[PDB]
Amino acid sequence: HPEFLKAGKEPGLQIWRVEKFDLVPVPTNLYGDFFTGDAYVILKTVQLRNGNLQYDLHYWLGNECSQDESGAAAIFTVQLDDYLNGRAVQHREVQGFESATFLGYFKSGLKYKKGGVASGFKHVVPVVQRLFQVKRRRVVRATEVPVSWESFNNGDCFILDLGNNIHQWCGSNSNRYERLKATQVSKGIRDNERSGRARVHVSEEGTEPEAMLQVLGPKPALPAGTEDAANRKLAKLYKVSNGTMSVSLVADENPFAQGALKSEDCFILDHGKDGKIFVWKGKQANTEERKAALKTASDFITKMDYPKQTQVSVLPEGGETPLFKQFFKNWRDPDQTDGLGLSYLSSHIANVERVPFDAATLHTSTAMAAQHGMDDDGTGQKQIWRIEGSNKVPVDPATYGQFYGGDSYIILYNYRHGGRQGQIIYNWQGAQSTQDEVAASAILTAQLDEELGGTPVQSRVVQGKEPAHLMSLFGGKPMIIYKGGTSREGGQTAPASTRLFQVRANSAGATRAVEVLPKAGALNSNDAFVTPSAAYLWVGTGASEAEKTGAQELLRVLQPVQVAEGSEPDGFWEAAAYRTSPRLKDKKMDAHPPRLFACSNKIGRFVIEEVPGELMQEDLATDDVMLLDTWDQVFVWVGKDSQEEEKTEALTSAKRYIETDPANRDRRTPITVVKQGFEPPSFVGWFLGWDDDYWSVDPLDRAMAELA
C-alpha cells in the first residue's frame, strides 16, 4: 500500500509507471508518453451521474517490456482493484492495440518512445534529437524511429524534434487530413514539453529547411505506405471452472440469454475473431478465482491460439459495460429501473448535459434535438406522395397520417429549427408493399433529393419501426398504420374480420397506431391498444395520457368501451405471455451510447473502424463517409470529397453495418442519410462545440498558421 490513497478519490485521470516493482506517477503535462520497455497503470475516474465514482483500470504493456515488469504491473492492477472494492473494470492494453475506451482518453494522441527503466531513462521535464512517425488515421500514433532517411516514406508524416525547433515533414502521397492529425502531436511537444517556447517548422518534400538536412544529409528517393470484413456477428460464451484450466461452453449463438450468468461462476465471452474477450466475475465465485481473473483470461487466449495482443476486459457483476450487454437478448438489469444512470456510463458521454424534452424550447438547443430525435415540432409544410406503379401520386390530403402496408409513400418536409432551416425526405416502405413499388419508392426518393439540390436529408423507414420525429407531423393527430391495404384510387377493398392495434407514444407526446395481429403475445403493458360486436380500449399498466387520447382519435374515425388491465371482460380473452418489462426511454442513451464509425467498401470486403473518445466535429473527414449510430437510428454522414461510389453506397453501407452488428439488431431500424454541411439538428446536437463555419476554411489550413 504505497500511495493508493493518493488517487481514485477525485474524478479524473491518473497514470503511474512500474519502475523496479513500484508505482511512480507520470508528470501531469506528459500523459500520453509511454516507453516501449516499461509498463504503466492507468485509472480513469468518471462521476457516475448521481454522486458515485466509477473506475476503469487499464495497465499498458510495451513491446520491449520485461516479463518481470508486465507481471509487476499486472500485480498492481489486481491489488488496486481490491483496494477499490472490486467494482472497477480492468483492461489489458498492449502497444498498438489499445481498446476503444482507452484511446478516448488522449485527444492529442499517444507517443511511443524507445527506452525504459532497464536502459536508464526517466520522465524529465527541464538537448534533444528525436524522430517520430505518424501513420494510419483517426488513431493518432507517433512512434520513435531511428534518426535517418531510412525511416521515411511518402504516405506518412514525420516529426523531427530538435529542441528549440520542431520540424514537421509530410510525404507527397500523404493526405490533407493526416497532415492535420500530425499537427496535434507537434503542438503537444511545443506546448507540453517546452512550456510553449519552441518554433514548429513544417515542410514537404524538396522544401526541407536547412537545419533538417544537416542532421540527415541529402534526401534520396522514398517509397510509399501501405495499410476486416464482417467477422464480428458471431461470438461464443463459455463457463470457467477452476491451474488446470477447464472451460465449458454455455451457448454458441451470438444472441445470448442473460439467464446463463450464474453468480457462483466466472465466464469468458469469446469475441477473439474481432480481437476482444471479456471476463465476467460472478458475486459468488471464490476469492482465488476472481483474483486470478487476469491470468485466467490469458490462458484462454493461449488455448484458443488467439493473437497475444487480443484485448481483455474484466467486468464485476452489476458493472457490465454497454458493449458487453449488447450480446444478450434485451438486457434487463434487476434493481436499476429508477435512479440516475445505469450500471456504466461510457466515458465519452459523462460530460453530456441530460436535457428533458420541452416542446416550447426545441428551436434553440440542438442538443435536445439529438437526445430525442426531433429536428423540430413536426408542424412545417409537408407534401406526401404515394407510389403507384412507377411514379409518385399525391395522397388524399384529408387522409394525411394514414399509411397502408401495401403502398409506399414519399414525404417531403420543411423543418424550421434555430436560425435557418432545411428539408427531410421520408420514404415509408410498407411491410406488405410489393417488390416493385418499394424499390421504385427509394429510386424516386433519391431522385427527389437530386432535383431538390442534393441537400435534403433522406431517411428510409420500414413499417413498424417509425422514428420518434415522424409521429408528430400531423399536429396531435396520431399516425395510423394499417397492416395491409392501399389508398390507391378505388383500390380499397374491405377490412378484415377483426384487427387489433397498438398505440405507442413518444417523448414528444404524439402517438402512432400500428395494426398488429389479434393475439395475446402482442400485448404490451407500456402501450395502449385498440370485433364485430364493439370496441375495447385497453390501457396497460404503463399506459400514459398520450396513448389514451390517441386511442380515442382512432375511435373517432371508426365507439369505445374502456377497460383496464387485469380486470378484463369474459368474452375479452377470446383473442399467452405478453411483454411486461418497460421500455428504456430517458436512460436508453445510457444503455446504448452513441458511437461514430468510418466505413469503406473496398474490394468485396466491408471494413469499419470506430473512432473513440468524445464526439468531435473535427473527426468528420471530408473525404470519408461516417456512421453516427444512435440506438433508434443510424445516421450516415457523407463527406463532400468522398468517392463517388461510396456516395451512392450510403444506404448499402448502413445495411451491411446493421446486419453484422452482434446485437442481432432490428432489421427495420431506420437509416438516415445526411450530406456534409447540411446536418439536421438531431445530428449536430451530439457534437458539443460545433462551428458552422468549421468547414468554411479548410481544416488543415486553419491549424497551419493558427499556431505559427
Side-chain angles (χ1 to χ4, degrees), residues 613-633:
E614 289 184 23
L615 286 50
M616 293 199 286
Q617 171 185 21
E618 295 69 31
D619 295 320
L620 290 189
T622 54
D623 66 338
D624 276 333
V625 174
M626 321 292 295
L627 295 167
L628 179 56
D629 194 15
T630 319
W631 186 253
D632 310 332
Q633 190 183 10

Side-chain angles (χ1 to χ4, degrees), residues 375 415 455 457 617 620 637 674-684 690 695:
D375 298 290
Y415 75 94
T455 63
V457 165
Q617 171 185 21
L620 290 189
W637 184 89
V674 184
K675 315 289 189 62
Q676 168 183 342
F678 306 91
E679 304 80 353
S682 62
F683 176 93
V684 285
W690 187 281
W695 286 291

Side-chain angles (χ1 to χ4, degrees), residues 400-604 606-661:
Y400 268 25
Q402 304 187 78
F403 300 82
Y404 297 78
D407 296 334
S408 297
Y409 309 82
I410 290 184
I411 302 90
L412 174 58
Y413 178 91
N414 298 340
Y415 75 94
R416 156 148 168 78
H417 181 286
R420 291 179 186 169
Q421 71 198 332
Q423 295 178 293
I424 312 176
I425 299 175
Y426 283 90
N427 177 14
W428 193 85
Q429 303 182 1
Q432 287 182 12
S433 194
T434 45
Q435 291 311 302
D436 52 326
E437 300 200 318
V438 170
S441 67
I443 296 184
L444 292 160
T445 296
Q447 291 196 349
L448 176 58
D449 197 9
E450 277 170 47
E451 53 174 283
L452 275 174
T455 63
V457 165
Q458 291 173 76
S459 196
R460 166 204 136 284
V461 53
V462 172
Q463 179 184 334
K465 246 281 187 163
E466 296 73 18
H469 174 253
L470 189 65
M471 328 177 189
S472 315
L473 275 68
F474 329 102
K477 283 170 180 177
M479 171 178 176
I480 301 174
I481 302 168
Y482 306 83
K483 188 65 186 174
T486 177
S487 174
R488 277 187 249 104
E489 310 300 343
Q492 169 267 336
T493 64
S497 47
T498 287
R499 44 213 214 270
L500 291 183
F501 291 77
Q502 173 178 9
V503 188
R504 190 153 143 193
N506 60 358
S507 308
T511 185
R512 72 185 207 250
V514 189
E515 180 169 343
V516 306
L517 282 54
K519 294 180 181 177
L523 271 309
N524 200 285
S525 295
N526 306 279
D527 315 294
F529 288 76
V530 174
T531 191
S533 168
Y536 302 157
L537 172 36
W538 178 83
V539 292
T541 313
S544 192
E545 171 64 18
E547 44 193 357
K548 293 191 185 179
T549 58
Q552 71 185 1
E553 261 58 77
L554 175 64
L555 271 40
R556 190 264 199 180
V557 184
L558 188 276
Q559 302 169 332
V561 178
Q562 300 176 337
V563 51
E565 176 178 16
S567 55
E568 313 96 354
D570 35 21
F572 174 95
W573 209 92
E574 199 190 354
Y578 52 77
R579 186 62 283 186
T580 306
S581 51
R583 301 193 178 272
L584 297 86
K585 287 176 178 41
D586 272 329
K587 293 181 301 297
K588 171 137 58 65
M589 168 180 157
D590 292 71
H592 305 293
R595 299 186 228 62
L596 180 65
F597 297 97
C599 58
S600 290
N601 216 325
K602 50 183 67 176
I603 304 187
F606 194 67
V607 55
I608 61 176
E609 292 193 355
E610 181 177 0
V611 51
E614 289 184 23
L615 286 50
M616 293 199 286
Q617 171 185 21
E618 295 69 31
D619 295 320
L620 290 189
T622 54
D623 66 338
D624 276 333
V625 174
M626 321 292 295
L627 295 167
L628 179 56
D629 194 15
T630 319
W631 186 253
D632 310 332
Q633 190 183 10
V634 178
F635 289 85
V636 177
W637 184 89
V638 176
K640 189 219 310 168
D641 316 328
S642 50
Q643 317 183 0
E644 188 72 24
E645 297 175 351
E646 291 300 276
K647 283 192 180 190
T648 60
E649 285 303 280
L651 258 182
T652 309
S653 302
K655 301 212 176 200
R656 286 286 290 170
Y657 165 78
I658 302 169
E659 291 180 0
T660 68
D661 189 284

Side-chain angles (χ1 to χ4, degrees), residues 261-273:
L261 262 57
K262 308 187 176 183
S263 294
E264 303 84 21
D265 301 328
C266 298
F267 304 85
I268 298 178
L269 177 48
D270 178 22
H271 203 170
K273 293 312 187 72

